[PDB]
Point group: C2
């Protein structure tokens, strides 16, 4: 039923991208065709144009990450390497967008831990999870990534204080399972959501 998931994802994505385009087109045309005229209304219109343009950028980057994840398939080549190297990439990648969205992003208790993972594939996974949290969050919210371990497994928590579709998270689950690991989620309609990634310790 992967095929149907892909169809429903594409259907949902089409709507989510067309809507912001139709909105910033209509507001722009409204100004250039002389329908909106009052300075306050021109300014409110342009603020929406800018907001929709930023939302489109975020939607497009999220979709392309899902596309790359899918195109790379199940190819996982784990290397023993610090987990902090991956989290530091996530930290620079989302530094500006966290500013923009008013989000506090934290990376906690991971210093000097050496894990076994595929950097490029886990980048794709963490991108999709952060992208997901960034959808459902508001200014003043937090996205906290925390490391832990049990006797056989390294553990990453991604927590936020926050058919259509699940594909992104379903591909994430496949990549993690190809690491020999697991992913679970807990969500409360209070508080927010936590993803739990477990990966086998380096042998």
């Amino acid at each position: 039923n992967l095929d149907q998931m892909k169809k429903d994802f594409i259907a949902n994505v089409s709507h989510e991208l067309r809507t912001p385009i139709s909105l910033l087109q209509g507001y722009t045309e409204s100004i250039v065709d002389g329908i909106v005229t009052e300075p306050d209304e021109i300014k409110e219109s342009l603020a929406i144009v800018l907001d929709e343009s930023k939302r489109l950028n975020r939607l497009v980057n999220e979709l392309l990450n899902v596309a790359r994840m899918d195109a790379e398939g199940l190819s996982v080549n784990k290397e023993v390497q610090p987990i902090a190297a991956l989290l530091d990439k996530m930290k620079i990648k989302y530094r500006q967008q966290a500013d923009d969205l008013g989000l506090n992003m934290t990376f906690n208790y991971c210093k000097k831990r050496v894990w076994s993972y595929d950097m490029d594939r886990m980048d794709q996974v963490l991108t999709n999870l952060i992208d997901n949290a960034s959808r459902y969050t508001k200014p003043g919210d937090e996205i906290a990534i925390t490391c832990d371990e049990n006797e056989s497994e390294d553990i990453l928590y991604i927590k936020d204080t926050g058919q259509g579709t699940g594909l992104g998270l379903f591909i994430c689950k496949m990549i993690i399972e190809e690491h020999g690991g697991s992913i679970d989620v807990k969500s409360e309609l209070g508080k927010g959501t936590t993803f739990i990634i477990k990966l086998p310790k380096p042998e």
Copy 2:
């Protein structure tokens, strides 16, 4: 083919970035009070409008290709006229043919029943017309015409000018048909689709 898809996404990433950067940058200069004089704002919003149209065209072309890949080789031909398909194309590209200054002509196609999967052929014709739209300029023409040989129905897509085309070929071959391409550098390209007659 994994490198075809990887190369397509890389190309798509590059082409989407430009218009999105322009929309955001040229708008923000106005909201932040950097670009202020009426002449100036007019020229900036013309760019935003033009780039929003470009983005939309690109997004629709990409999602069509995604839908095509997602349905794989699923073809269920149904016996029905072709004019139903070409009517949807005419509607779907009416506004875009203005935006780009293109003349899209659809010759008369007698309403004999063809045999074809509407949604897969819609996808195919969308991709071929999208393709022609990116190799033309204002003034140019895209003309769709129907023909027949003894055992096949023939659609010609000719204009006066990767992965998408490859999947088009797969879909047409699953109809039991064939796709060919002809091009005289300068004059333009002709795609030739042959489908088995129903009867």
